[PDB]
Design a protein around this nucleic acid. Structure first.
Ligand SMILES: [As]
Ligand SMILES: [Zn+2]
Length: 193
DNA sequence: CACGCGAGCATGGGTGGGCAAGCTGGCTCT
DNA sequence: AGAGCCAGCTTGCCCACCCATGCTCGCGTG
């Protein structure tokens, strides 16, 4: 019945967690990436056990604040009309995946929420993780889109059957100056949090 | 013994200060 | 000689205070 997807961490039986390696900088204190518009934001997928064949990785944005949570996260009308299309991403989608030949962009028939899915691929031998390159195609501040409202990215590991294997999430701010903004927010947390 | 009146209250709204956040300007760098 | 920084600027927006205005309340009246 809910149209709001869960943001609850579920590291699950496979021991699923994310890693993060200026265009992009991660704050572990905030669990929050600070990204520039349309720039690569690499996210690592770590598991303790190997998911089954046909496992998929989905990413979806939701507004972080209770008052906005039920509103679907979409690109603003300016960026939507911008001719920055890679050929596969529908222009209303905020989150894209770059560098994957099997990306699928979904628009939920019931909830109208946008997601982007790629096959899960096990790390190379001797590698601890697999990396997916996401891009956020609007600033947090975009008038008529996010409009300065913080978002969470929800990453789910899903079997081909649709069972939830794992779920992790991190906040995102897409902004002109990620370094400045990370420092500001961390100082605000230490001083007034 | 119902009503009239002046005092004060409640409650949405305005205002000024400060903040947020893309952007510009100069140096520096290569 | 184009480009990268870093500081500072710009500008919508937030926030707290105060105001605005219908209504309540106790007094006194008729
Ligand atoms: As990023
Ligand atoms: Zn936008």
């Amino acid at each position: 019945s809910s149209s709001v997807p869960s943001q609850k961490t579920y590291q699950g039986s496979y021991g699923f967690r994310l890693g993060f390696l200026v265009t992009c900088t991660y704050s572990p204190a905030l669990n929050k990436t600070f990204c520039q518009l349309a720039k690569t934001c690499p996210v690592q997928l770590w598991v303790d056990s190997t998911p089954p064949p046909g496992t998929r990785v989905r990413a979806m944005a939701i507004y972080k604040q209770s008052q906005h949570m039920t509103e679907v996260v979409r690109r603003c009308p300016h960026h939507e009309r911008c001719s920055d299309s890679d050929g596969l991403a529908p222009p209303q989608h905020l989150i894209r995946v770059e560098g994957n030949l099997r990306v699928e962009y979904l628009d939920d028939r019931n909830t109208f929420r946008h997601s982007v899915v790629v096959p899960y691929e096990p790390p190379e031998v001797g590698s601890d993780c697999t990396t997916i390159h996401y891009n956020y195609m609007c600033n947090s501040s975009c008038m008529g889109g996010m409009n300065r409202r913080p978002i969470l990215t929800i990453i789910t590991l899903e079997d081909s059957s649709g069972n939830l294997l794992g779920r992790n999430s991190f906040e995102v701010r897409v902004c002109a100056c990620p370094g400045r903004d990370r420092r500001t927010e961390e100082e605000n947390l230490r001083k007034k949090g």
